[PDB]
Amino acid sequence: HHHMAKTRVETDSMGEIEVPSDKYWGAQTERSLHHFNIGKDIMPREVTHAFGILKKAAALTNLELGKLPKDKADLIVQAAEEVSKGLLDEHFPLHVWQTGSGTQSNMNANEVISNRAIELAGGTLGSKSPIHPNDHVNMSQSSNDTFPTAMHIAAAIAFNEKLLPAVRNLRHVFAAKMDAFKNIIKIGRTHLQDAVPLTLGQEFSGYVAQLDACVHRLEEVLPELYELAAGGTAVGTGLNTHPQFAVKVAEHIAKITKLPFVTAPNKFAALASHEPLVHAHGAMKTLACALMKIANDIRWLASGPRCGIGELIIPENEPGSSIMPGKVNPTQCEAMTMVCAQVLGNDTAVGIADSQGNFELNVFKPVIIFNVLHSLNLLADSCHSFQEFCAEGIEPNQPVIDYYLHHSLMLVTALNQHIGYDKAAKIAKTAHHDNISLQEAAVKLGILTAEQFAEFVKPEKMISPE
Amino acid sequence: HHHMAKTRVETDSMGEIEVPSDKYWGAQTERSLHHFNIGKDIMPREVTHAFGILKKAAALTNLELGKLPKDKADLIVQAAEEVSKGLLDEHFPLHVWQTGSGTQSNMNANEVISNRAIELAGGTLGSKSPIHPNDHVNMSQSSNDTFPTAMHIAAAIAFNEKLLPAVRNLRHVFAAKMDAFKNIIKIGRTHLQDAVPLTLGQEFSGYVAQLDACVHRLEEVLPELYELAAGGTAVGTGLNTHPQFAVKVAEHIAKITKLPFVTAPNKFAALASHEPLVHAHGAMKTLACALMKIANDIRWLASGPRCGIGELIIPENEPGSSIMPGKVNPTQCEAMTMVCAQVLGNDTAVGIADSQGNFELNVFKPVIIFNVLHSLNLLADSCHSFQEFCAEGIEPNQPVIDYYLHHSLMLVTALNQHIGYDKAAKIAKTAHHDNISLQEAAVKLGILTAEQFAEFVKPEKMISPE
Amino acid sequence: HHHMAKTRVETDSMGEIEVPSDKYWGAQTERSLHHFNIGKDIMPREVTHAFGILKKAAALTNLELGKLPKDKADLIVQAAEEVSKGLLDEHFPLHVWQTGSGTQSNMNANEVISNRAIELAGGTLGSKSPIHPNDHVNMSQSSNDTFPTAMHIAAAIAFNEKLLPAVRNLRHVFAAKMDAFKNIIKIGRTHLQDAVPLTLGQEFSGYVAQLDACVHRLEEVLPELYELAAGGTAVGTGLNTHPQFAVKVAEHIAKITKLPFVTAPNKFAALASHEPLVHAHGAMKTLACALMKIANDIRWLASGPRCGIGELIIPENEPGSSIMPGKVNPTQCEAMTMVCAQVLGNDTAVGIADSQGNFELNVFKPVIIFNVLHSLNLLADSCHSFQEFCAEGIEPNQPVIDYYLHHSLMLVTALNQHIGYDKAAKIAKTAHHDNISLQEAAVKLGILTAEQFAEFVKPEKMISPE
Amino acid sequence: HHHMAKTRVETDSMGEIEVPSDKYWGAQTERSLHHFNIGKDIMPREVTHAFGILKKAAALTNLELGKLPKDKADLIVQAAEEVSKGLLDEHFPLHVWQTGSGTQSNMNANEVISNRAIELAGGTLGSKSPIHPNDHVNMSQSSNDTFPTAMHIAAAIAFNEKLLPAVRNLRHVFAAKMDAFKNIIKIGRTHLQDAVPLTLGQEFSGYVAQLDACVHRLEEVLPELYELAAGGTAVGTGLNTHPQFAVKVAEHIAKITKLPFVTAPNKFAALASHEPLVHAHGAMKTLACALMKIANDIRWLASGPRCGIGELIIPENEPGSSIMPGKVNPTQCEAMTMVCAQVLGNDTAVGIADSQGNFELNVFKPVIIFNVLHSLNLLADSCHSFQEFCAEGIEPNQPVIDYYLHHSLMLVTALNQHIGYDKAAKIAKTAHHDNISLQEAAVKLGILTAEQFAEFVKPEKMISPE
């Protein structure tokens, strides 16, 4: 192994290893990079930032418990704050496809925070003095209860700060369009066939209701994620931690994040299984199922400009051609529906990985959180992009909407109570056979005048019960 | 088409069709059987029974609204009660793989209830008099808002009466075993490797906590399922139903079932999408992920009798061989883990089908409810079978548990505070090299007497924090 | 346990058990029914029939090897032939969710064939004389190498006799429509937007090519399925079978079926894993992905009759209403697309189950073959139904096809070489702005006469390279 | 929008846009980055390199057809060679979650190759002179037939050069271990229970056979991938390309790659669907199912060091602790099994995306190739890492293997032919009851001497047929 850049010597129990001088990680992170260079997927930075939160909270807890000297605590807190702010993300090189407990990324956090703290103290990086990655930064913690804590911190923060606001904000654009479109009457479509009318606002209200329900399902995940594994140590018993550490470290994490993190009531389930994250992903899967449908309705309704449906007009954002006026490819719908297919696959992966726990520890932890955060960021980013570059600009093509409404055969049942089923069916059959409107067929057959037809067939009286 | 058995003539708008005389379905059910003979999967009987509930509630509602005469209402209610009790299930022959709105099974219910009601009145089956399948049994309803109502009734009743009790009951067997095993100390296993100890009760407490969380996730689905589509009619607007029908029919369904069914606040989402059923299935998927792990722990811990782990003993229920004493194949674990694999696949199918709605109607309704009820019955039945024939009979193999506890190298860290890390590591290395116990190595090296070892290494002091 | 019907006493190593007198199964099948009453799914009858084939072949082999007397062989062959013909399927009551090796269904076959053979000999059912279910019907076989042999026999026969012919036959209907439609020019659609033209025959040729490729992928599975596990006995070594049994029994199975069954070259992989069946299901998944798209194109192109696309007309098979002329719901497309969603979920289940083998035996065998045969029958049946009741009757709506072709803006690039890009773009922009055709805009602007437009814009010259 | 770095002005039909001066992409790539900033996933570099191959081949073809001047061809070829060698990968910033046709990445290739070619000619970047991204680099190509060509080139090259060699090489390490272990007799395990013996070589032969079959399934994909969409242009007809372009460009791609690329016989299926890539992913899924099982056998057999199975010893690669001798966590098995879970989820995503084609174009192309290449690289990299750091170092723990072999009860059936079933069963029952070996029980009961037992029970005579 070699590095073009200058290196320093670090040590672990396997001996010396050279580490790039401008990086803060240590011997074990460097050594592990050599053995787990699988794929391109770097551990998600939300997990790195959550490790910063955990290590800060641990230092404050160990200080309060009298275990960690104030001067060492202050240095660790300062470095862990930089980690949690994302300022040291280039020092976290490990891939997802690592130790299944995530211990390697826990040690990456310990080594980075130790070496940055050593630098803040004016010491020699790699010397483990005055801040030792295991003895100080990992004090009262274990190889097994740290990564699952980072998983739940990362997922809960991302739900609250990124995903739920993105879905709420898209819902309120659809609601604003719903209100704008509340008096536009359009033809229904069931089984893809022409059907009785509804307003464009009513149809958009379905999307609003779908998104409302998804918001609620995502919120219902959060209490499970607020429960933290920290304090279970190696197998769940808390052996070799302080009797107060589990509760106090969660108290500090709650204070740091202003979210109601608590210690997990059952540490054995918290280490041996990850159904809270299966549930988090399942709620995201329900959102992908709703978004697939909503995005598909928008692109089908806007299809054209002349040989599709064409009831809606969407904004064009990629360059067009002056020789192709009216043509708009629905590229935000395409990105969103591709995201939705990915989320349904990621949901399969998460459930498979969760099902594979053995005894005291599920060792599929990195792939579980990787898929949760991948789906979350894809969904949130696509909601935001689809909102800005498609949904906010949706407009009705009123002449097309109106054409379908008054040229469909489906309004004919408004005639039954006036002329009877037989005469109404005759009007519809003649309209269909002669390729004319219901009104034109009624006049042609001498059954109704045009004024009688307009009195009897009022679409605004066909969008609610009697 | 032909029937060995005597037939009667029925009619629909395509003409005459012969229907077996001893069956209550009518022309459209018979005719559809000829076009949708796909697979072997008959529509689940819970859906049939829910149609009975809906049609009874509809008749009572239409009677109260003055639309349906009392004599016709009474006959429909009587026949619909037989349907809801399962007494007419042989008259529902249609397969899952039918019209994607489920309208064919709605018409199966209308025809059966009409012909049975005609028989109760002493009339001629097939005559549609005095009870017409469309004009009376389907009064105020539509082809599109009836099957989704049956879906939610069936799923909510099955959750409440079958699945949730089965999971609760399995949880309490594991809790009773947890209590029985609370003082049995065993070796932990992490990454499949020997680890620090925990009690067998603590390990079973993890399973108890997993099942508790699953119960809660399944309960959280129910409010979505209690909302019913009935009253949305063809496209969600309620055109061609009574303005009070949606609310009153749900009131009657709630009274019949003693569950809090209500009309859906948004009929457009209720017809165009089925995320409540995606969510119902997702919660079942979390249960499958937990059960896979629990069942696998039980069969691995009981593996043997001599060359596996062997900490547990499970009951034998299939015949054994007197020449193979001690051997027990974990067949309830095998059936359960196969069920869990099926549920994870069914969850993929449900999300795909839900994602495929278009405009005013999702027309994947039968496959969605088919998978929900299939997974539900597999999970509930396997919980019950695994409980009765495996979990209730789990016993510890105390000599094997004890052997591992005192022959593992992992208890050596109890020595550090007395003799130091170096001497403790020397004891462990000698034990490993010489294939002897930690106590034997400590004595062999002259570092500890046996009495000193027993004083310093107390597994009962190694299962909690300091 | 009890039975309304008369019973006889049977015995196994757990004692006496009552078995219905009119059923041919024995003690172990009855006893197992009491422990594995999970779900409704009875082991697929193709597996039962394949057990008949295996047991006939085994009897002929054991006769040839001198192990089985001729009189006993003849009786077993006669009963096993009845099993393989489906004549005894009501005597196979066990569910899929059984012993994960499938040994319970192997014993169901042994007991049925033994008791039917005893009856043919005039003996006492349940006495195991003169035909013993284990000592004669299971002679030279094991509990573990029999069900996987039945799996491969069932799957290979079903591929050859049912699935592949169904797909080939649907392909040739689409090819016949392709030929009929080869001169009908229609507008292309890309991203759902209007695009340059192609013939309806060219578009159908895509479906033909998709089905051809699927046929090839399904055929490529077969050599893996022809390799049989029989002869591996308990763990793959062949301990306790005749050195010639594995090869000779496969020779007899090949002769019975007229398919090239052979003994598996590696019995350890044949018992410990089932990737041939994962591959069989994966090829079916590719067919589901193609059929979803083909069925969706057909229903979208036929959507209407007036407010959708409407380029195609499909046959109506469920009763319509004289007041709704022209309306045809695409119910065969709906059943097919629901089947396709199911197959994608079943594919997830099969891969999960296959991944879960341990050591010498994968004990997820029933769920693997259950999903393979479920997907196979759904796909084959839906192909046949969709062919008969939809594809064979597809017709073009030529006036609608022609309207789109000549009212799209996309043909304008045919003008560039005659009038230049600028004038062509001006024609398109005016057509779009004024809601008129390209020809009308060209005339309106004085750029072209109508005769010049017709000379320059020839759709029949726009469906191939220069 | 802004850039800290110096920028140049580029133009598209939407106007001016600033592009970083040190980047080779152009207006449309920059503008699209602003609209499709979804997730972190950059289009896989294999697709970028394949675009280099396509654009080189296109330039050579257009030169041969007389359409492209030699001086412009030479410049494009030079720049496209740099792209195909990976030398310009920092100039391809677009994400997977883009236009569903992949046209945006096609234009990224055109703009990079144009601007690099302009630089090679000494011109002004952004001027589109002397090399125009559309008029020259995209000459004879379309927005829709280019990305699918890159998909197939990338996948076929990656199969041949990376995935298949990685699987073959892992197979031959397992085969070398198989040969080394051919005389080591161990206890079988079925259903996780002790079973009759087999050699460790026989058990490893199962893994070898599984990998051989997977190699064959992966090879069988390749003929589908060698067929290329290039030449189908917008909808499959080849409108607006040269009649010889499709065949000649594939000829040039075959010459460049030394792989047998050919033009696709049906361009409509090639644009409208992607079952070749579903099949490619399905074959990778079969490999994930095999690897999950193989990796699990290795980690279970090596579990310990004292309270698991412990028949194998694996190398330790992460630092251990001198106080935990003998303990080795199976971290390569963990990374591999996590990869396998990911591949099963990715397979679900690929099938869903492929099923969603409409009319002339499937617009899920980026997510399909993203998952194919993600799964491929994870599988190939994990095979290589698992080979180097686990499989090559697998050793038997012969004392543990031997202990199980001679202390299992399963060898007792070797006694039946000498002492009868009854006496053999008595020996087994006494051994089990008294916790002693079969030999000790036989002696204790006075049934056999130790020498008689050793003569009658020879494990080397128990691993094959009579």
UniProtKB/TrEMBL annotation, chains A, B, C, D:
Q: Per the UniProt record, which EC number(s) apply here?
A: 4.2.1.2
Xref: Pfam families? FumaraseC_C (PF10415), Lyase_1 (PF00206)
Quote the record's binding site residues for substrate.
101-103, 132-135, 142-144, 190, 322, 327-329
The active site consists of H191 (proton donor/acceptor), S321
Location comes to:
Cytoplasm
Q: Where is the Fumarase C C-terminal domain?
A: 411-463
GO function terms (MF aspect): fumarate hydratase activity
Site residues (Important for catalytic activity), renumbered to this chain: E334
Keywords, A to Z, come to:
Cytoplasm, Lyase, Tricarboxylic acid cycle
Judging by the UniProt lineage, the source's domain of life is Bacteria
A single GO BP: tricarboxylic acid cycle
Q: Kindly indicate whether the keyword Lyase belongs to this entry.
A: yes
A GO cellular component annotation in the UniProt record = cytoplasm
For the keyword Lyase, the answer is yes
Domain annotation Fumarate lyase N-terminal: ranges: 15-345
Segments forming a coiled coil: none
Known catalysed reaction(s)? (S)-malate = fumarate + H2O
- Record pathway: Carbohydrate metabolism; tricarboxylic acid cycle; (S)-malate from fumarate: step 1/1
Q: How does it assemble?
A: Homotetramer.
Q: What is the additional note?
A: There are 2 substrate-binding sites: the catalytic A site, and the non-catalytic B site that may play a role in the transfer of substrate or product between the active site and the solvent. Alternatively, the B site may bind allosteric effectors.
Family the entry assigns: Belongs to the class-II fumarase/aspartase family. Fumarase subfamily.
Q: What does this protein do?
A: Involved in the TCA cycle. Catalyzes the stereospecific interconversion of fumarate to L-malate.
This protein is called: Fumarate hydratase class II
- Recorded source organism is Legionella pneumophila subsp. pneumophila (strain Philadelphia 1 / ATCC 33152 / DSM 7513)
Gene that codes for this? fum
